[PDB]
């Protein structure tokens, strides 16, 4: 690795210039191949430096200090590179010791709606660039969808929980900057049927294998067979899974049919032989009597009488020859039928017990996408695949909130401030907010730019919770309706004693019906204290929100009793139940590529808004309204690192707009 590993850790190809780089350095990428490799090295080496020590600012001076010839010969190239990497949050992002104390006076004013990770990330960057930044948060806390329950020694995340690998993950840097206790997740997940009995390794492995094979099959349907539109409606993943299962049940029958069809052909071939044998035994029976009657003519006899005896003798042994050759055939076909009837093809494709364990695997997928598989886009639901990180997944053992809180330090954050209206014009913006506690107490905020990090669910509200003046353009609003915003809930169970397998991190529960496969289907053991965490996914997620905490905790204990013993499961000391769809500051959990949407909508969401001119015939205005957030980052949607990066992205785009890009020359 070394320099090339730093490029990978920064999600960049080590030996090629990116599209963004082509924009900022068009002189180099269009120039000779030699210069490009110098550029690439400088970029990579600077990245390495920052990465190797991400707790202190990396200045231009410090960078040039540690470069060789001919890489330190051109100092304006080094400066252009450093500035670029600093602007777009590739270096000097998050929480680091600043060498040169912040600029004495600020330039430009930005209001940031929401203090979730994306908002916070962007805020820190803009403040780093010397801008006046104020965040407006409706909640009485930072972090938004990164929520962490804390009470006594109990620590459990109701929101974001898992770091999906450190290989190229920006959160890898963050974790070195903040005291995050990152614990690996053990892959093994024992299942337990409705009765409370564990699924045997026989079934467990051979149902899961079928699940993975069913997915690959849908991918084959999508890409190879091009099965993507059905009656004008776009085909969902759920639709395609049904179609694949049906075709697998069909094949099972097709096999059985042509197997018994093999039997009737041989059985009916045997029928014809038996008829021939019966008709020959009939003629033998007759011929014997004739030969017998011929031998009643005792010698001496004339020659014709002698001939008759000899004739009938020959004729009989000839027919006895045939019958024995037919009894030879009879023996062969008779065992050929014991052959085919001994090894029948598969009885069923999947049994009722199988189809239930397979439903758990669907529930798992419904949890991962926070949505019923009938809503996911077949073609695109997994479009962000290529950009997944390497390394084992980890959990934040001390609670994920430690991250937003750390980012929130040294920032102007107005909590309990619900943005009601965004007004943007050629000359600037005003944001109208209210106090969440006394809703008549009104605030007005004037700024050069607004960065909107409102959750997609919020942007989807009907009627609007936030009004845009002027209304957002058709292309933007259509993107909002097209896109999917899913739901997923957590049940926190705090006990006085560990009654589960301590070496097992997670164990499943198989529901009775397809309709309730998501309901409390998975349990997490991750924390120091005895806490069990139960997921509600799929269609079940939305319905469990209309049910009281007691009943939910009820069904939780019921299940846990069934697995570990009706007396080994004590009453929970503390319980929490999330309701993300109900939560007015989220209106759901995270986004999914809905059927009829694509990854391209995510781009549309990230595109800023430029108002019309005040005076007609006045020059084209500056862009005023900007969008960051988990639903704006095509390559990392529905995640923390995705939000984090989207924030960094807009902060760069905004600073370029209002402070100017000095590095492009």
């Amino acid at each position: 690795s070394g320099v090339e590993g730093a490029a990978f850790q920064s999600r960049l190809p080590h030996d090629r210039m990116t599209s963004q780089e082509a924009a900022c350095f068009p002189d180099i990428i269009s120039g000779p191949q030699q210069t490009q490799k110098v550029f690439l090295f400088i970029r990579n080496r600077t990245l390495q430096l920052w990465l190797d020590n991400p707790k202190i600012q990396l200045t231009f001076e410090a960078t040039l200090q540690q470069l060789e010839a001919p890489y330190n010969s051109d100092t304006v190239l080094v400066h252009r590179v450093h500035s670029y990497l600093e602007r777009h949050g590739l270096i000097n992002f998050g929480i680091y010791k600043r060498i040169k104390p912040l600029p004495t006076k600020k330039t430009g004013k930005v209001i940031i709606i929401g203090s979730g990770v994306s908002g916070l990330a962007a805020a820190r960057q803009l403040q780093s660039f010397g801008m006046d930044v104020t965040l407006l948060e409706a909640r009485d806390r930072v972090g938004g969808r990164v929520a962490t329950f804390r009470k006594g020694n109990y620590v459990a995340d109701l929101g974001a929980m898992v770091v999906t690998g450190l290989g190229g993950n920006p959160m890898a840097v963050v974790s070195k900057q903040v005291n995050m206790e990152l614990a690996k997740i053990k892959q093994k997940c024992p299942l337990y049927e409705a009765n409370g009995q564990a699924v045997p390794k026989e079934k467990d492995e051979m149902v899961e294998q079928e699940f993975n094979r069913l997915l690959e099959a849908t991918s084959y349907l999508s890409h190879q067979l091009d099965f993507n539109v059905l009656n004008n409606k776009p085909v969902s993943l759920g639709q395609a899974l049904e179609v694949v299962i049906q075709l697998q049940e069909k094949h099972v029958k097709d096999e059985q049919i042509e197997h018994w069809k093999k039997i009737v052909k041989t059985q009916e071939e045997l029928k014809e032989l038996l008829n021939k044998m019966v008709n020959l035994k009939e003629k033998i029976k007759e011929l014997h009597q004739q030969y017998k009657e011929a031998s009643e003519v005792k010698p001496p006899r004339d020659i014709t009488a002698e001939f008759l005896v000899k004739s009938k003798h020959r004729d009989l042994t000839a027919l006895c020859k045939e019958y024995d050759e037919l009894a030879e055939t009879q023996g062969k076909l008779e065992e050929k039928l014991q052959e085919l009837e001994a090894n029948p093809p598969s009885d069923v494709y999947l049994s009722s017990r199988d189809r239930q364990i397979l439903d758990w695997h669907f529930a798992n997928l419904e949890f991962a996408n926070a949505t019923p598989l009938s809503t996911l886009s077949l073609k695109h639901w997994d479009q962000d695949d290529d950009f997944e990180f390497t390394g084992s997944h980890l959990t934040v053992r001390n609670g994920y909130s430690c991250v937003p809180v750390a980012l929130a330090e040294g920032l102007d954050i107005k909590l309990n401030t619900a943005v009601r209206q965004v007004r943007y014009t050629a000359s600037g913006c005003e944001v109208i907010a209210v106090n969440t506690r006394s809703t008549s107490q009104t605030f007005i905020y004037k700024c050069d730019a607004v960065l909107c990090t409102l959750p997609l669910g919020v942007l989807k509200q009907q009627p609007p919770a936030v009004q845009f003046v002027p209304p957002l353009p058709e292309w933007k609003t259509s993107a909002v309706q097209r896109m999917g915003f899913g739901n997923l809930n957590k049940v926190v169970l705090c006990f006085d004693r560990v009654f589960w397998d301590p070496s097992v991190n997670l164990f499943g529960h198989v529901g009775s019906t397809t309709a309730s496969r998501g309901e409390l289907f998975l349990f997490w053991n991750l924390y120091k204290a005895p806490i069990l965490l139960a997921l509600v996914a799929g269609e079940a997620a939305g319905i469990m929100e209309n049910i009281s905490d007691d009943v939910i905790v009820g069904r939780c204990l019921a299940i846990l009793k069934g697995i570990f013993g009706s007396s080994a499961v004590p009453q929970p000391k503390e319980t929490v139940v999330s309701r993300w769809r109900a939560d007015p500051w989220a209106r759901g959990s995270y986004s999914y590529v809905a059927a009829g949407s694509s990854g391209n909508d995510y781009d549309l969401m990230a595109q800023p808004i430029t108002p019309g001119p005040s005076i007609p015939g006045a020059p084209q205005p500056i862009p005023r309204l900007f969008f960051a957030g988990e639903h704006t980052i095509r390559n990392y949607p529905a995640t923390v690192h995705g939000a984090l990066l989207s924030g960094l992205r807009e902060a760069g785009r905004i600073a370029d707009q209002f402070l100017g890009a000095m590095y492009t020359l």
Binding site: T164, F367, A368, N369, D384, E388, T639
Partner: peptide, 6 residues
């Protein structure tokens, strides 16, 4: 996303 898949 697929990433969360247990």
């Amino acid at each position: 996303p697929r990433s969360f898949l247990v």
